[PDB]
Paper text:
Unlike the isolated LG domain that readily dimerizes under several guanine nucleotide conditions, full-length GBP1 forms stable dimers only in the presence of GDP·AlF3. This interface is primarily formed by a hydrophobic patch between the LG domain of one monomer and an aliphatic stretch of residues at the C-terminal end of the linker region and helix α7 (Ala315–Ile322) in the other monomer. While the MDs undergo a large spatial transformation relative to the resting state, the overall conformation of helices α7–α11 remains essentially unchanged with a root-mean-square deviation (r.m.s.d) of 2.03 Å relative to the nucleotide-free state. The GED (residues 481–592) is likely flexible and not visible in our structure. Our structure was obtained with recombinant protein devoid of the farnesyl modification normally required for association with membranes.
Guanylate-binding proteins (GBPs) are interferon-inducible guanosine triphosphate hydrolases (GTPases) mediating host defense against intracellular pathogens. Their antimicrobial activity hinges on their ability to self-associate and coat pathogen-associated compartments or cytosolic bacteria. GBP1 is a multidomain protein consisting of an N-terminal large GTPase (LG) domain and a C-terminal α-helical region (C-terminal helical domain, CTHD), divided into a middle domain (MD; α7–α11) and an elongated C-terminal GTPase effector domain (GED; α12–α13). In the absence of guanine nucleotides, the GED folds onto the MD and interacts with the LG domain and MD to maintain GBP1 in the resting state.
Numbering used by the authors:
A (entry chain B), B (entry chain A): 6 to 483
The structure:
């Protein structure tokens, strides 16, 4: 069928575009297919391994430098050696964690494309199964949910997971270990690699919070991948004659490594299912063409936002949580330590000043290293907005306080006497002595509120109709 | 001097506690110390290489199973082989990436402790310089800065970095690569180990946004680590006769590994400096035990705001960014769809409910897989608080607007009634219908606000002063 593999999706400066020359060939296949992807760290031998999957010497380019060689996703359509009527599709993948590119965002995109387009997903790692490998694999599986949610109608996304024959939809999982050298023992009893992986995904007793954080990744991985597997391979050669592996035959390699490669290939051939979409329809060439088009567009067409390409970004989100905590801490000392109404504007100035000389250092204690004090000035703006909100709350609370104090000391001594008492010949002469020598003098009771001083002026501007009015001229009549 | 190592900080159930048996022997040593600390991926040979630093076969316990063996931090004190009067203190720390333990919180704490206590830091890795290794190393670098901010007074943290002879404070860096297999080549030109390290730490051209994301880890690494070096080591044994390595002489090992380990040991002995605190003070026994104590209490004294366990959870916290996007869309709709003093309150509530439905459909379109709908209910509470904010905004808006209307349609009337032809009997016979005439003409005037009738009622209860006085005056006129 295909003499050589050709690039399916390109990767130029962080963009992903479906390759029309690969789409043209892909559209020409009508049989249902079996797809076998792969992912793994960069310079790990992924291309060398998928050469054995095709079973042909010479294939995906290997390379032997410290630079990454395989870029983008490369397909290779071959007839299935063990299942008649179906076409085996091998996908090669750009290595994870490249230092020359230094971009985790594109890494996760290629990872997600591999798992989504795969009906048999293969992970690659060196030495041991690792917590970092678990976190990266776990993080991808939910990103796969994000991608499908933007291009799939219903029947398997976030509404119905089990009891829908979904075990044929999600890809079967395989974990490969490279250059395994440790003895397969744990707690005393030896372990088969299947038992090793299951122990790595073994749940933890009960339900604490640190136990839930432990259990959460393993549970999600178990749900995502119905069937799981694990393999181990020794070093292909004893010394480092590792640049001539494209030219070396099987006898020069370690016989155990050849046996393990044959076992892995036999497992894949005899247990890989046919890729199917939601609904059980077997996926063929044109279906794959539309699938890769939709997924590539879903990645590079606006939506699907992921900011994995940093650690400072998530640290700054935690720092935003610290802004929330500092706001709570500031509100605690501004609500419980000090009262609701006020005494003087300078008093509130100093009060907010010391509350800030607490909150800012609380921020810096619970914070992270922020660039150019961007988040620091964001907290400053947030605290300024909160200070303005508290000043409005002060101008409202002190307004109510002054109105109520007038209604409780001034009104009960003015309204009850403004009816008939001030009809006497000279009520104003003693009303001034009443007001300006008792009411204003007692108004100096603490918690006046300097923002409510103008309310006194408004009240006087409202009282001019009984200061001199209501016939303050009865002396002339008498 | 010392026959064997001992634990310095025990790590039990994720808790770090200083070991008094180790603090006691620390307290009895007076000579200055050079401290070499190691970290790396778990089950890699950290303990094996630190055995070669002391140059004694059998030492730090190795462990040859797939389970982690070295737990916590283990200290060893020896006389300095090449610096008379100094003492070499080796710190072997628990490896990162444990699957049985499965907690990135504790691994980061152990990492940070090793960096802080080290006068010479050794990062151990497998295969190649790795972007994940840079991502973790960068994350640690900020972590050590923050930890020092909780136990160091001044002169070195966040205020004065350069031009303070700080090159002695921050530890030198050695990146050791294990089981190196690739040829040393890049862009066609061969590379030395240090050239490889600086090429992986080579910054990129100019100023884009992604390029700053690229440059950010490398800038921090090259800043906080003054002197950098890299070393490569081949496989110690051709076959995997690797479980009896502590019983193995140098003859049966590959001579290249012995040569590289000798060069690395020579570099360490001839270039590692005495540990210097802030200000240049050399470290001794009491100072090192004081450092250990204060850093242990710094870690275990409620100063743990930085976490990276379940990185998908932090990617979920980007639903907060989705919340901000929904809030931006909601506020834009309020600014454009509805005018600021909306019609009464029922229309406000209905349009707000429709806009909240639009906001929630935007939220479900953008976000995904809410954990027990926690972010859903937090967005509901945020929009509830925003409804309260728009409610007081409409309250003030109605206050301003109805005040403006009443003043523009009442002030000539209130001026002409204070000084006019209303003193004569029958003058109020025109006002007694005109006040409700004005009220009804306002009622016909649109765009009231929720507090329209209430505000007019307060105006009435504040404006019987210019009714009753002249009402009584009219009685005298009659
Ligand atoms: N560490 C390791 N390297 C291998 C193994 N098998 C082959 N290699 C070498 O790894 C080198 C790079 O692999 P490469 O094809 O670049 O993988 P890719 O970059 O992920 O596509 C090849 O030159 C192989 O010689 C293995 O099992 N372990
Ligand atoms: N991959 C690798 N393993 C080694 C090397 N040297 C020793 N080992 C083995 O790796 C294990 C050492 O792990 P260890 O030193 O305990 O790391 P730790 O488990 O974190 O303390 C032992 O089995 C050693 O025999 C090496 O150069 N490369
Ligand atoms: Mg490749």
């Amino acid at each position: 069928h295909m003499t050589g593999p050709m690039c399916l999706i390109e990767n130029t400066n962080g963009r992903l575009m479906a390759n029309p020359e690969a789409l043209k060939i892909l559209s020409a296949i009508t049989q249902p297919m079996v797809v076998v992807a792969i992912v793994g760290l960069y310079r790990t031998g992924k291309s060398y391994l998928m050469n054995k999957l095709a079973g042909k010497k010479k294939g995906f380019s290997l390379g032997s430098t410290v630079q990454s060689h395989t870029k983008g996703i490369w397909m290779w359509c071959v007839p299935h050696p063990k299942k008649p009527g179906h076409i085996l599709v091998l996908l090669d993948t750009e290595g994870l964690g490249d230092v020359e590119k230094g971009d985790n965002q594109n890494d996760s995109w290629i990872f997600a494309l591999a798992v989504l387009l795969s009906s048999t997903f293969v992970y690659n790692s060196i030495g041991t199964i690792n917590q970092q490998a678990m976190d990266q694999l776990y993080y991808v599986t939910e990103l796969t949910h994000r991608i499908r949610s933007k291009s799939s109608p219903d029947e398997n996304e976030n509404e119905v997971e089990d009891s829908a024959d979904f075990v044929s939809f999600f890809p079967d999982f395989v974990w490969t270990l490279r250059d395994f050298s440790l003895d397969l023992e744990a707690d005393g009893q030896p372990l088969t690699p299947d038992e090793y992986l299951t122990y790595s995904l073994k749940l933890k007793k009960g339900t604490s919070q640190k136990d839930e954080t432990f259990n959460l990744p393993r549970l999600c991985i178990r749900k995502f991948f119905p069937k799981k597997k694990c393999f181990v391979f020794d070093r292909p050669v004893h010394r480092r004659k590792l640049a001539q592996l494209e030219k070396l035959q099987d006898e020069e390699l370690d016989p155990e490594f050849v046996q393990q490669v044959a076992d892995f290939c036999s497992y894949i051939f005899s247990n890989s299912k046919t890729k199917t979409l939601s609904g059980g329809i077997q996926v063929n060439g044109p279906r794959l063409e539309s699938l890769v088009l939709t997924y590539v567009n879903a990645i590079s067409s606006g939506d699907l936002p992921c900011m994995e390409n940093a650690v400072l970004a998530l640290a700054q989100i935690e720092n935003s949580a610290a802004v929330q905590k500092a706001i709570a801490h500031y509100e605690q000392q501004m609500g419980q330590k000090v009262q609701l109404p006020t005494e003087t504007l300078q008093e509130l100035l100093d009060l907010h000043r010391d509350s800030e000389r607490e909150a800012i250092e609380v921020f810096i204690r619970s914070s992270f290293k922020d660039v150019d004090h961007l988040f620091q000035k964001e907290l400053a703006a947030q605290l300024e907005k909160k200070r303005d909100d508290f000043c409005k709350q002060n101008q409202e609370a002190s307004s109510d306080r002054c109105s109520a104090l007038l209604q409780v000391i001034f009104s009960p001594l003015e309204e009850e006497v403004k009816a008939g008492i001030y009809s006497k010949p000279g009520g104003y002469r003693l009303f001034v002595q009443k007001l300006q020598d008792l009411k204003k003098k007692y108004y100096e009771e603490p918690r006046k509120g300097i923002q409510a001083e103008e309310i006194l002026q408004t009240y006087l501007k409202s009282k001019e109709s009984m200061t001199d009015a209501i016939l303050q001229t009865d002396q002339t009549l008498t």
